[PDB]
Design a protein around this ligand. Structure first.
Ligand SMILES: CC(C)CCC[C@@H](C)[C@H]1CC[C@H]2[C@@H]3CC=C4C[C@@H](OC(=O)CCC(=O)O)CC[C@]4(C)[C@H]3CC[C@]12C
Ligand SMILES: *[C@@H]1O[C@H](CO)[C@@H](O[C@@H]2O[C@H](CO)[C@@H](O)[C@H](O)[C@H]2NC(C)=O)[C@H](O)[C@H]1NC(C)=O
Ligand SMILES: *[C@@H]1O[C@H](CO)[C@@H](O)[C@H](O)[C@H]1NC(C)=O
Ligand SMILES: *[C@@H]1O[C@H](CO)[C@@H](O)[C@H](O)[C@H]1NC(C)=O
Ligand SMILES: *[C@@H]1O[C@H](CO)[C@@H](O)[C@H](O)[C@H]1NC(C)=O
Length: 823
């Protein structure tokens, strides 16, 4: 507590060395940012913890079964009716073929060089209704009848890549002629930069595409999210915020006579700028990467809170001018610093601690923001206690100067009991609404409102009639043994009642994973059925695969009519299992439909003696909300635990982005609870009065509880961003109440020690400072976040922090005086 007085005392005696060091420190840090600063843009690096189980499972899936396809999805929409017409078919057939056959990317790399191919000799997989006709424009008359039958019976119109396409994948309505949209999905197995270049060319192509009148297209490339997420220009917004603060600072920092002090106003804002630069340049040396949050929020948050102590010290120093006039300018600043240091330091520590508590959230972008805010707040506090004190001493010495309201503080203290009843009811009403807070972070808010991804995300929720695929990865299961393979199959009478196939079939009518499971092990055993005389043919008298050109009577089935049984009697085991597995996983699907090459060539990781890992593919039903995604993620985790005897997990591409919600609620209670107890201990050490510290913590709890209830009423979902913002609201609320509580606790001997008198003296001392130096300054800092290009910075930052200011100010200015006079 005395180091601030010692630090401020050193600053007044050595202002130029402090000021020279400050600019030198700023210059070097700004140089580091200029040179070594890096911006993190990858969504996975921003939202996914590298140490999460889902991330590690994604690494295993990528290494063993390749990274999931790079998906480029296009929606073509007829908002007021059906989209299918020969005019639109003629247009899209030309556009669709150009994209996949003629759209070179520079480097002369097209779709054919990057597309997914089920087999090396197959064609590109294009998930579109144009593939029902093999990418050839149908007749002007028969396209309606042909398209309907193809939707009804996909097998009858198999595409050139031999994978049937269901209408729920290609359209918005199973009634194809009435569907308002049709979906086009492009899959790329290439994961090098050449794929990135082509997707950029594809993205530029679609933005410049002339859609027919009455139609509309939304799309998404694998690079779209990264490009759109980190595509913002808010330089003017920051300047506007700092100009409004400059105008307010000039008015607030003018002398009691009414004379403006421009240097003090400018210096206070320059110190805020230095705090951001010094923190950003400091964290660069540690290799920390900034993100969109740093560019879009940090200048506003630090501006909102980095200017408060300037008013508190200057206003207190102004008070030291009228009171104790014989004191010199140096002594006035030191005395003002000394008495206001305990409240400033305690609030600073609460700000520091809450940010560090918010750093326990594992989202790197959110964790990065908390760490950046922690350094900025510490840098801001040091600068205010050294740089501003040096400037204030320099300015005041050079410019020598000779020098509602209280009525409300009495009228409101007449309604102490009524005030407590109003706020007590508000807190109790708020508790009822806490269970009503919704989880999630809508993706439309994350991207700029003008982005083309906003339309695409709406189209997915509106028109996509399929859900993300789910892969059941089973590893280290010795499938050469009958017992182990009985734990997977579901087509045979000896398979366990709780086998992978059996259990998952039950979940189809009980969970979000409602699609049939592609069981390769069942297909492999079905492929061995002697009834399938065209499957598993061996040269007679030899254990060699029958050549496809070989005619009948020159080969024999791997199994005789009496060996294969539906109770798995005679099924291959040991080395025989792997012997015929090579035959099955290489057989084409043309003569034998049960051949596992096309469907399961990449579904198995194996060698000549064992299958080390394998994949069983299913999918969720269409997920059309944050609740659906959270429930879908919950189902995957729950089902993975349904097989304690299997080293297995469920993989979906979106799982990494919804890890937090599995434990968000318990984490919110733990982190916010930890923050409030931290307030109690920090307050107790400084206030040295557990009663006052308890009431301060109690009031902060009511503010946070009320904010949480208002989040439910205001439609602010709970996620990593909201949780950290709400954790910051804990620190922000403390600053609203710390000075009121401390002034009540410590009063001069001249004033009466009565509780009512102490509350009045507190309101007649810093009540103005709380309004001018905390409340109004906070609003100006974050007000422009309401107009941010991305609605996340308005929904989850402005709305929460704007609500914090109102709720905290009401509790600090009305309830807290009543809660102090009584109790
Ligand atoms: C630096 C600040 C601005 C935070 C950045 C966080 C984003 C990288 C996160 C927040 C919400 C996330 C989204 C939440 C939900 C989804 C849906 C889900 O997508 C699918 O299942 C595919 C089909 C569909 O889009 O519905 C997974 C990706 C996505 C877009 C997520 C992508 C990553 C996002 C945009
Ligand atoms: C991703 O696509 C690139 C092409 O853009 C492939 O790289 C080519 O590979 C061939 C054969 O090795 C070379 O002759 C070309 O010079 C490469 N071109 C470029 C631009 O690098 C790459 O193989 C693809 N990725 C995978 C996994 O197949
Ligand atoms: C879009 O829907 C309206 C509603 O019937 C329809 O009249 C119009 O033709 C559609 N657009 C196209 C390009 O067909
Ligand atoms: C499996 O079925 C065959 C005939 O269908 C029968 O001979 C055999 O005993 C059955 N297996 C077992 C373990 O009973
Ligand atoms: C096959 O893979 C298994 C599991 O990884 C391993 O234990 C075994 O040594 C491998 N055998 C050969 C011949 O590669």
């Amino acid at each position: 507590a005395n180091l601030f007085t010692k630090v401020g005392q050193f600053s007044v005696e050595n202002p130029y060395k402090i000021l020279i060091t400050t600019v030198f420190s700023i210059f070097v840090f700004s140089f580091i940012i200029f040179q070594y600063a890096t911006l993190e843009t990858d969504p996975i690096n921003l939202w996914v913890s590298k140490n999460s189980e889902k991330f590690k499972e994604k690494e295993y899936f990528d290494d063993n079964f390749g990274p999931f396809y790079r998906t480029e999805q296009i929606f073509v929409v007829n908002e007021t009716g059906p989209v299918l017409s020969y005019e639109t078919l003629h247009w899209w057939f030309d556009v669709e073929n150009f994209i996949t056959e003629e759209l070179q990317s520079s480097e002369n790399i097209g779709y054919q060089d990057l597309c997914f191919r089920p087999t090396e000799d197959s064609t590109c997989v294009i998930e579109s209704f144009t593939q029902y006709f093999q990418g050839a424009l149908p007749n002007k008359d028969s396209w309606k009848r042909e398209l309907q039958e193809c939707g009804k019976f996909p097998v009858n119109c198999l595409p050139t890549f031999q994978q049937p396409l269901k209408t729920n994948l290609l359209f918005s309505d199973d009634d194809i002629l009435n569907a308002h949209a049709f979906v086009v999905t492009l899959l790329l197995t290439n994961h090098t930069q050449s794929a990135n270049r082509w997707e950029e060319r594809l993205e530029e192509y679609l933005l410049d595409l002339k859609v027919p009148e009455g139609l509309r297209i939304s799309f998404n490339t694998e690079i779209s999210l990264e490009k759109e997420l980190n595509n913002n220009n808010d330089i003017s917004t920051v300047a506007i915020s700092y100009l409004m603060m400059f105008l307010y600072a000039t008015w607030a920092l003018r002398r009691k006579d009414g004379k403006t002090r421009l240097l003090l106003g400018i210096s206070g804002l320059l110190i805020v700028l230095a705090s951001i630069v010094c923190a950003a340049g400091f964290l660069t040396l540690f290799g920390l990467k900034s993100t969109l949050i740093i560019a879009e929020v940090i200048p506003f948050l630090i501006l909102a809170i980095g200017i408060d102590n300037i008013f508190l010290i200057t206003h207190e120093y102004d008070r030291n001018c009228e009171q104790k006039p014989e004191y010199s300018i140096d002594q006035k600043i030191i005395s003002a610093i000394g008495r206001m240091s305990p409240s400033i330091l305690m609030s600073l520590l609460c700000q520091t601690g809450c940010f560090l508590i918010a750093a326990f959230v594992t989202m790197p972008a959110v964790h990065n923001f908390a760490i950046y805010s922690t350094v900025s707040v510490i840098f801001n506090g040091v600068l205010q206690l050294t740089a501003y004190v040096s400037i204030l001493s320099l300015y005041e010495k050079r410019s020598n100067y000779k020098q509602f309201l209280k009525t409300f503080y009495f009228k409101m203290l007449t309604q102490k009991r009524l005030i407590i009843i109003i706020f007590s009811a508000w807190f109790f009403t708020s508790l009822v609404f806490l269970p009503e807070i919704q989880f999630g972070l809508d993706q439309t808010l994350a991207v700029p409102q003008d982005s083309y991804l906003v339309d695409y995300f709406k189209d997915v929720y509106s028109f996509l009639n399929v859900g993300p695929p789910v892969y059941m990865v089973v590893k280290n299961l010795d499938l050469t043994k009958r017992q182990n393979q009985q734990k997977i199959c579901g087509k045979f009478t000896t398979c366990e009642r709780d086998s992978l196939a059996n259990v998952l079939e039950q979940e189809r009518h009980r969970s979000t994973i409602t699609e049939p499971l592609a069981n390769w092990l069942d297909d492999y055993f079905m492929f061995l059925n002697p009834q399938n005389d065209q499957c598993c043919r061996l040269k007679k008298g030899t254990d060699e695969v029958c050549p496809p050109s070989f005619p009948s009577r020159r080969c024999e089935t791997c199994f005789q009519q009496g060996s294969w049984n539906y109770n798995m009697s005679g099924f291959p085991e040991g080395k025989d299992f792997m012997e015929y597995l090579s035959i099955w996983i290489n057989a084409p699907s043309d003569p034998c439909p049960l051949g596992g090459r096309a469907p399961y060539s990449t579904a198995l990781v194996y060698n000549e003696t064992s299958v080390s890992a394998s994949v069983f593919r299913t999918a969720h039903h269409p997920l059309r909300s944050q609740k659906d995604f959270i429930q879908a993620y919950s189902d995957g985790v729950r089902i993975s635990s349904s097989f304690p005897e299997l080293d297995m997990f469920a993989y979906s591409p979106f799982y990494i982005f919804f890890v937090q919600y599995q434990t968000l609620g318990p984490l919110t209670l733990k982190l916010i609870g930890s923050a409030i107890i931290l307030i109690f201990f920090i307050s107790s050490v400084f206030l040295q009065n557990i009663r006052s510290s308890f009431l301060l913590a109690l009031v902060v709890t009511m503010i946070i509880v009320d904010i949480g209830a208002l989040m439910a009423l205001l439609g602010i979902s709970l996620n990593a961003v909201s949780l950290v913002n709400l954790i910051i609201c804990v620190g922000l609320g403390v600053e609203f109440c710390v000075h009121i509580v401390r002034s009540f606790t410590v009063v001069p001997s001249e004033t009466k020690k009565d509780a009512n008198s102490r509350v009045l003296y507190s309101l007649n001392t810093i009540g103005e400072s709380v309004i001018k130096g905390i409340t109004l300054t906070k609003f100006i800092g974050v007000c422009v976040l309401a107009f941010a290009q991305s609605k996340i910075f308005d929904v989850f930052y402005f709305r929460m922090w704007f609500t914090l200011i109102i709720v905290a100010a009401l509790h600090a200015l009305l309830f807290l005086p009543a809660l102090l006079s009584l109790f």
